[PDB]
Amino acid sequence: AITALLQRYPDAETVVLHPADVPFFVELCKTLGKPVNFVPVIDKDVRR
Amino acid sequence: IDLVTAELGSDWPRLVAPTFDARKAVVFDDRWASAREDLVKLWLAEEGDIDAQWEQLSQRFEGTGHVVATQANWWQGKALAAGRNVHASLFGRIAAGAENPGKGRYSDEVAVVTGASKGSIAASVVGQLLDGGATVIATTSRLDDDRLAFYKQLYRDHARFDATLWVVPANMASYSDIDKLVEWVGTEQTESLGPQSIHLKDAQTPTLLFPFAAPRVAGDMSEVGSRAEMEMKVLLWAVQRLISGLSKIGAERDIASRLHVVLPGSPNRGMFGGDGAYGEAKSALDALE
Amino acid sequence: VSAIAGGRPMYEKPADRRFDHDVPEKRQEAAMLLSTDARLGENDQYVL
Amino acid sequence: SVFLDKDFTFVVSSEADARAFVQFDPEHTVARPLPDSSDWEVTRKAGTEIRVPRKTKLSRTVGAQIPTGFDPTVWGISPDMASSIDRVALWNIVATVDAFLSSGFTPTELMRWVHPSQVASTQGTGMGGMTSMQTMYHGNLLGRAKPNDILQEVLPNVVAAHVMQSYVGGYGAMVHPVGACATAAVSVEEGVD
Amino acid sequence: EIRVPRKTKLSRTVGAQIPTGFDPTVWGISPDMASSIDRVALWNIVATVDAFLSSGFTPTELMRWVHPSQVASTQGTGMGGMTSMQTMYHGNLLGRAKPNDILQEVLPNVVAAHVMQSYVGGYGAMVHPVGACATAAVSVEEGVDKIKLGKADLVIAGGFDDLTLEAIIGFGDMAATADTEMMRAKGISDSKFSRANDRRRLGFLEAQGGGTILLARGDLALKMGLPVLAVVGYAQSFADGVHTSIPAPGLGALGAARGGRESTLARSLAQLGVGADDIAVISKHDTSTLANDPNETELHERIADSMGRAPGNPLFIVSQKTLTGHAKGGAAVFQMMGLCQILRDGVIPPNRSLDCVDDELATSGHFVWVREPLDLRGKFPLKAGLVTSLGFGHVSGLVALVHPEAFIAALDPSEREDYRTRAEQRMLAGQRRL
Amino acid sequence: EMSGAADESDDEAPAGTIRALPSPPRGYNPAPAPEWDDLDVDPADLVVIVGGAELGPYGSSRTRFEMEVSGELSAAGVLELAWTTGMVKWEDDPKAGWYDTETGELVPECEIVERYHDAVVERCGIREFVDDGAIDPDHASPLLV
């Protein structure tokens, strides 16, 4: 699946995650059904 | 003014407002500039092979030639190398076109065409007149740059040597426009440079006249139903004054030259009931003859 | 000392060398700027 | 800048100037054609903005000034030039002449040994054209008659441009440093360069 | 004596203005700076930052490779500090409260002085040309001059100017600016009224803004491993001469083409192994005035004619003033910027404001005026551009620009390959930072 | 029949959500043949342009070049101009994203062209002078006699 998508968009391999796509991912971690298995960000909420 | 409006209606006074003014005219007499840009665009974008009929058609459009345009073609051709197949075809065809340019001749025709707009019979006539080495006065109802850009596109394609095109804002519904336009068409052909810029009205005695101006039925102001009455002024009466106008210029400035007015008659009146417009209106052209 | 006493040192030039002969010099205007070694002769009093 | 508390007495003005009055105030000013004289009356209502003349006393009473009685005319500058150009221009123009006088006179003698495009002008300013600048910003806001060449004459480069037009006639480089107080030495640097 | 308030109606209703809503604050300039400094300062300050962003960020990284006194600033102005000037002469005569720093802030050099204080902190050269309209190209000339003599190894070249009230009234009075009331009478929209080389060209549109470029020693650029945007093959300013006549335009920029094979223009090219035919593009000043356009054309026509430009191998010319309008001080830098972008992308920008070419320009056969973009792809390269600008009072200038890949040919195959490695890594890190 | 054919419409289902955005700017090399000697040219005597930028009526060098060469902005073109013109703002308040600065509304990257560019074109480039100085030269310029 990963190969299928990023073949269509080869530029995804050479570039940065968009600065507006970073809050989106961190936002998704907060609304996720089962809590995220990792730590996405070091911040005030790091204990949580 | 209320009584006058009561008789004539709402749309008639508003549409009869003046449009034409002598300062908005635009003249394109340059082939030399447009032919050079036209060739280099072909040379760079060349894809199709020698079997193309477009190359023969474009060569006839590139038939506009003088010391100026030859200096362009003879150069880009001589600068061309043996690098590839396209370069072999371009160099040979250009050298042949440079040779055909040297001996190129021209004709001359002076015409005034109305109703020349995009996607029409007259537009196909205009480009063809330009293809015949003519001088053409082209009128446009809409003065917007989208209409202005179209005639530039049409000219830079179909223009030959000796060809000069003229585009102007014009309204055939206005008698003032008709009088003012031909007063512009018939005066001088002179440009005075004083402290300021004054262009004296260009005088070219019309050979062919093409009253293809064709009002269409669009009724936004509610004008519906009164249009066939008003168009009778435009299609005939104002044409009559247009014919009379160019007759005065010809007589005053004293030319024996016959202006050929092609009368856009509607086909075969009486055997069609479905047109609703063309069939009836143009039968009085027999009376005009 | 000749300049100080007479008020001579400031002379606003008519630019004779530019226009010296109306017809050719306007044509020679191009030719001058183009070729390197073209200069003023002193004997005619600074001619172009 | 003061706001008029009560309507000012009408004053006579031309139609062109009075219509202009309306373009600023218009709720606050009132203008009418006078049928006989065709001119207009201008009446400022309450709420208008007025600029009223005043004065100030300042600290600096002394400066180092070119000796009294100096004239560019005495040096031989034509009256037409004196008018059309800023005071700062008269300084650089005469100085350039006297600068040449150290060696040669006729600036075109340089064109004997050198192709004209090899003549350069590097001339610095901290501001330059100051008079011509203050002449526009007063004059325009004051509608006083002022010269049309103002912005051309306020360009700190235009002063030696005037000298190149009037004197040397070189075909070559022109540079015009701004070094604030240091332009002079900064200019030499680029002249050397 | 009383001074009584009145009004005036003026001819110029339109100018080329920085997009509405621009703030130096959004870019991150502190409010204290915005207050204390002229509007023109905000233009050169932000431009300098974005100019650095092309390669490096921290200005003190320059002090790693270079002793600080080898950092130079060459920044041109036609006037500069205009607001701060008009602020004093109003304010003082009006007794209004105005800033005490006025005369410091009206010095056309103080703007980049503010940038050196706030950002780079270099210990080295500062020069500030006045080229009228030509300052930008005149600035590049001296920026080039500062490096070759070892005075400074890194220079910032550029120009900037502002559009205010009394800037307009000076031009309109001088008759040099296009009269808007006449343009509307001819049915001309605001975007279409700046037309270079057009038969109908009515005089220039006044604009505002600023721009700068970072010029460096070729050896340093490789060593620092920054991007190479282009090689400056030459730069020159040129005067004209003695004459009375006001319309008569300066032709002195021809002095660069003098000598043929021995000419500065051709030798500059020849040192890269480039010929006279290899200049495809000239960036004209193209003021859209009736005086400048045909003269600059005749000028470029002649500089090609004597250097042995192959007959009918015309210089394809762009007019950026038809788009951006004419900003006096920052004129030739915007053209300088466009020329670099021309070289790398290959694309030659159109003049879309051209309805018809002036019939007078027909006499020039070494010149071609393109109304539509000619886009050069990977199979269709280009080589060298030329920026030309004519300032007021015989200020004329020429900057020969050449493609970066001409420089990479002097490294030998081993070091050439080594440089591409460093430049590639920088681009990736540069895209990151940006 | 043909009016009816024109009068009889229908809706073919189209489900589409489009967005606008791009990778960081790249460079397309050109094909150039060069016969050259290496050591001959002194790098210390050469002047090379490291970088450059501009502030003008069309925005920065990136957006201005797009308008000059293309004539229309890309995704990054409108995104940058809307940012410079101050149409779009960035809040760390909840919903964490790009917001419209005027009306205080959250915006994605797609609608930037639709919601803004029409107004951007008008208020950028060349236009009637917007008065930030409370003075209009063309309309009313203060005079004192």
Catalytic residue among E128, E133, E300, E403: E133
Contact F48, E228 (CB under 8 A): yes
Q: Give the span between the Cα atoms of E59 and E68, in whole angstroms.
A: 10
Tell me whether F139 touches chain D (CB under 8 Å).
yes
Closest CA to E278 of E316, E328, E242, E247: E316
D175 sits in which H/E element: strand D174-175
Tell me whether E205 touches chain C (CB under 8 Å).
no
Q: Which residues pair with B169 in a beta bridge?
A: B140
Nearest-Cα residue of chain C relative to residue D166? C12
The length of chain B in residues reads: 289
- Determine the distance in angstroms separating the CA of E398 from the nearest CA of chain D, rounded to an integer: 10
Closest CA to D75 of D63, D91, D58: D91
**Given its phi and psi angles, is residue C47 left (phi above 0), alpha (psi -120 to 50 degrees) or beta?**
beta
Q: Which residues contact A48 (CB under 8 A, 6 or more apart)?
A: none
E300 is catalytic: no
**E contacts of D53 (beta carbons < 8 Å):** 1-3
Closest CA to E337 of F62, F29, F47, F30: F62
Put simply, the chain E residues between 362 and 401 with a CB less than 8 A from any chain F CB are 373, 375-383
Q: Is B253 helix (H, G, I), strand (E, B) or coil?
A: coil
Please name the residue that has the structure tokens 């190209």. Answer: E137
- Determine the distance in angstroms separating the CA of D188 from the nearest CA of chain C, rounded to an integer: 25
Q: List the beta strands (DSSP E) in B66-196.
A: 110-114, 135-140, 164-169, 190-193
What is the rounded radius of gyration, in angstroms, for the C-alpha atoms of chain A? 14
- Determine the distance in angstroms separating the CA of F65 from the nearest CA of chain D, rounded to an integer: 29
- Across the D:F interface, residue pairs with CB atoms under 8 Å apart total 18
Contact E119, E49 (CB under 8 A): yes
E133 is catalytic: yes
Can you spell out the DSSP letters for B275-287?
Answer: -SSHHHHGGGHHH
Please name the residue that has the structure tokens 């480089």. Answer: D173
- For residue E400, count other CB atoms closer than 10 A to its CB: 25
Q: Give the span between the Cα atoms of D41 and E305, in whole angstroms.
A: 65
Q: List the beta strands (DSSP E) in chain F.
A: 47-55, 88-91, 97-100, 126-128, 141-144
Can you spell out the DSSP letters for B147-177?
Answer: HHHHHHHHHHHH--TT-EEEEEE--TT-HHH
Decide if E306 and C35 are in contact by the 8 Å CB cutoff: yes
Q: Which residues contact E51 (CB under 8 A, 6 or more apart)?
A: E156, E158, E212, E213, E214, F51, F52, F53
Please name the residue that has the structure tokens 């209106």. Answer: B281
Closest CA to B113 of B133, B143, B135: B135
**B contacts of E374 (beta carbons < 8 Å):** 40, 44
Pairing of the two strands B197-200 and B190-193: antiparallel
- For residue B265, count other CB atoms closer than 10 A to its CB: 16
Q: List the beta strands (DSSP E) in E113-229.
A: 126-127, 154-161, 209-217
PDB resolution in Å: 17.5
Structure determined by: cryo-EM
Closest CA to B31 of B128, B151, B156: B156
Q: Give the span between the Cα atoms of E422 and E427, in whole angstroms.
A: 9
Catalytic residue among E326, E366, E394, E403: E326
Closest CA to D81 of E244, C18, E394: E244
